[PDB]
């Protein structure tokens, strides 16, 4: 029942962690993103986006082209397993998704799609 993680993106373009692990029993997993720090959504917005590792470049490249107004995510992108909204300083957003959308045999990556960020802002998610 610890079926969450709190994760932070800061003004230094880093997530607080590079690895999330999801337990054995969770019907659902929740990611509670916050942005400590001072920069607004246009300078240093962060979202938390989850996909297969192979799907990550697509989601990031298409997201950029989709623009700020769309939280830098292609709308109705079936590659996205979970997303939060894009957030800036002092904001928060949480996403819950079904653990079953985690296809056994896959490797998963989380990342921010704000332009440039995913060079630093990425990590792995493993089903445990």
On whether 117 is known to bind a ligand per the annotation, the reply is yes
Checking DSSP bridges between strand 28-34 and strand 92-98, what pairing results, if any? antiparallel
15 interacts with Cu ion by CB under 5 A: no
Return the range that interacts with Cu ion (CB under 5 A); candidates 14-22, 29-37, 97-105, 112-120. Answer: 112-120
114 interacts with Cu ion by CB under 5 A: yes
Question: Quick check: 14 and 121 in contact, CB under 8 A?
Answer: yes
Q: Which two tokens stand for residue 42?
A: 């246009």
Return the range that interacts with Cu ion (CB under 5 A); candidates 38-46, 56-64, 67-75, 91-99. Answer: 38-46
Return the range that interacts with Cu ion (CB under 5 A); candidates 25-33, 63-71, 100-108, 111-119. Answer: 111-119
Residue 122: beta bridge partners? 111
* 46, 50, 56, 72: which one binds Cu ion (CB under 5 A): 46
Distance CA 14, CA 18 (A): 9
59 interacts with Cu ion by CB under 5 A: no
Instruction: Say how many C-beta atoms besides its own lie within 10 A of residue 53's C-beta.
Output: 13
State the nearest-atom distance from the C-beta of 52 to Cu ion, in Å: 20
41 interacts with Cu ion by CB under 5 A: no
Checking DSSP bridges between strand 122-127 and strand 19-22, what pairing results, if any? parallel
């Amino acid at each position: 029942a610890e079926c969450s993680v709190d994760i932070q993106g800061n003004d230094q373009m880093q997530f607080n962690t590079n690895a999330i692990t999801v337990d054995k029993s969770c019907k659902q997993f929740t990611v509670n993103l916050s942005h400590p720090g001072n920069l607004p959504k246009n300078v240093m917005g962060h979202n938390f986006v989850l996909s297969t590792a192979a799907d990550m470049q697509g989601v990031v490249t298409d997201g950029m082209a989709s623009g700020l107004d769309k939280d830098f995510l292609k709308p109705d992108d079936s590659r996205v397993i979970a997303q939060t909204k894009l957030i800036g300083s002092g904001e928060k957003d949480s996403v819950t998704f079904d653990v079953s959308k985690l296809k056994e045999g896959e490797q998963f990556m989380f990342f921010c799609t704000f332009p440039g960020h995913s060079a630093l802002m990425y990590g792995t998610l493993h089903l445990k």
